[PDB]
Amino acid sequence: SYAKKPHISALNAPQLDQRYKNEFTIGAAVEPYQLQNEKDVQMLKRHFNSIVAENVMKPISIQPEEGKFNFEQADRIVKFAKANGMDIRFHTLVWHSQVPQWFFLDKEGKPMVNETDPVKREQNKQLLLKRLETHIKTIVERYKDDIKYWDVVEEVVGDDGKLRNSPWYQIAGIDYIKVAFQAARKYGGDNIKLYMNDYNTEVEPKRTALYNLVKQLKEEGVPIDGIGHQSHIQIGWPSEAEIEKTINMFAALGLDNQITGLDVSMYGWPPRAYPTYDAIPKQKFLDQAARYDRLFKLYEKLSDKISNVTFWGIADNHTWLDSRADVYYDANGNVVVDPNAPYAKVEKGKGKDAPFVFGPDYKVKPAYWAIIDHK
Ligand SMILES: [Cl-]
Ligand SMILES: [Cl-]
Ligand SMILES: [Zn+2]
Ligand SMILES: [Zn+2]
Ligand SMILES: [Zn+2]
Ligand SMILES: [Zn+2]
Ligand SMILES: [Zn+2]
Ligand SMILES: [Zn+2]
Ligand SMILES: [Zn+2]
């Protein structure tokens, strides 16, 4: 929408959070170094009223060794948010990635998953659950008065619609999920809000498996307040109709919905990326703008069911999507972006994606104009 509109500095553009302030908060995922960068700081002050850490609140960053807690980086994000009136989300208490391996070792230092004795397996389950509770207790006791929204567990349902068979699940079963939520509620009180977080929440059979899991846990009294939808999506997929059905489905259980990691990749999956930002054709940015136009129109339609929409980054100069931006080369060394075309080699994670409404020079993209207007 409206490529007529100019590529002005985002520091001079109408504020994104103020455009949506009655519908939902507008968030950005950050690294602490960006709080020391003048442009990123001004971007956060101008456009965003919610914040989340893309990495430094993950388990391995918080307690990389048992009893060694590193809150210095998380503290910096919390302090910045409080100074600028931003909501904070905690990402994430429990996850099968970026998770220190000391969690899953028995008292003799061996992997708990290897244990065959059922009496010892049960001892390992209780030990793991105690470590889990202490990790959550220490974090929530420090942050309960500052951080309102909590991703308690992340990606606990596999894409095959079964519970993901992580060490958490192999060792403790489903109880690691119940213990995580119960611990957060106990040490954090009734005022913090507890989410189950996942990607591809729109996609069956994962969607209904997540639905069934949360419905059953709440029937058993496990405190779950909402669903965190990562929304790492594409220009075409998933369809707005399927996003809408997903949001409505979870809202019917009385759950809040938060969009916690929104980015609109320029590519399919697996991605065949352009090697640089400059190689991306203008038309892709128009396609992305029209997708963003439909997407935020749908979010507004559903604003009574969505409290927050967070982008997984600030501007196109920095996005975890670049780690997936594989560049394919044919035999003559030219770039291949057609998903079915011949190619000879791939350079994994060497290309550039362009997923946000702000460009890498901090000027607004057509996608920005598409979502700042009221059409
Ligand atoms: Cl309004
Ligand atoms: Cl990143
Ligand atoms: Zn308005
Ligand atoms: Zn309104
Ligand atoms: Zn603001
Ligand atoms: Zn995550
Ligand atoms: Zn990053
Ligand atoms: Zn629009
Ligand atoms: Zn307006």
The 3-state secondary structure of 209-246, one letter per residue = HHHHHHHHHHHCCCCCCEEEECCEECCCCCCHHHHHHH
Closest CA to 29 of 39, 40, 37: 40
Ligand in closest contact with the CA of 27 = 5
CB-based contacts of 272, cutoff 8 Å, min separation 6: 326, 327, 328, 336, 337, 338, 339
Q: How far is the CA of 314 from the centre of ligand 5 (A)?
A: 14
Using alpha carbons only, what angle is made at residue 99 by residues 44 and 140, rounded to the nearest 5 degrees? Answer: 60
Q: Where are the domains of the chain?
A: 10-372
Measured on CA atoms in the order 235, 239, 241, 243, is the torsion positive or negative? negative
Task: Label residues 97-114 b or e (16+ Cβ within 10 Å = b).
Answer: eebbeebbbbeeeeebee
SS3 label, residue 363: strand
- Would you state the structure tokens that stand for residue 91, as one six-digit string? 């990402």
Q: Are 372 and 14 in contact (CB under 8 A)?
A: yes
Task: Please list the alpha-helical segments (H only) found in 34-110.
Answer: 38-47, 59-62, 72-83
Using alpha carbons only, what angle is made at residue 307 by residues 14 and 163, rounded to the nearest 5 degrees? Answer: 130
- For residue 30, the cross-strand partners are 53
Measured on CA atoms in the order 174, 176, 177, 182, is the torsion positive or negative? positive
- Would you state the structure tokens that stand for residue 164, as one six-digit string? 């993901």
Q: How far is the CA of 27 from the centre of ligand 9 (A)?
A: 19
Task: Please list the alpha-helical segments (H only) found in 34-174.
Answer: 38-47, 59-62, 72-83, 118-143, 167-172
- Would you state the structure tokens that stand for residue 359, as one six-digit string? 């460009």
Residue count of the chain, please give it: 375
Q: How far is the CA of 44 from the centre of ligand 1 (A)?
A: 22
Q: How far is the CA of 85 from the centre of ligand 5 (A)?
A: 8
Ligand in closest contact with the CA of 303 = 4
Closest CA to 176 of 213, 229, 205: 213
Residue 339 and residue 272: Cα distance in Å, rounded? 7
Report the chain's terminal Cα–Cα distance, integer Å. Answer: 9
**Protein residues with C-beta less than 5 angstroms from the ion ligand 2:** 320
- Method used experimentally: X-ray
Q: How far is the CA of 298 from the centre of ligand 5 (A)?
A: 22
How far is C-alpha 329 from the chain's CA centre?
Answer: 31
Q: How far is the CA of 222 from the centre of ligand 3 (A)?
A: 38
Closest CA to 44 of 295, 233, 310: 310
Q: How far is the CA of 15 from the centre of ligand 5 (A)?
A: 7
Tell me how crowded residue 76 is: count the other CB atoms within 10 A of its CB. Answer: 17
Using CA atoms of 59, 194, 300, 146 in order, give the dihedral in degrees to the nearest 10: -70
Residue 132 and residue 125: Cα distance in Å, rounded? 10
Residue type at 38?
E
Q: How far is the CA of 172 from the centre of ligand 9 (A)?
A: 51
Q: CATH for 10-372?
A: 3.20.20.80
Q: What is the DSSP string of 235-298?
A: SSSS-HHHHHHHHHHHHTTT-EEEEEEEEE-SS-SS----SSSTTS-HHHHHHHHHHHHHHHHH
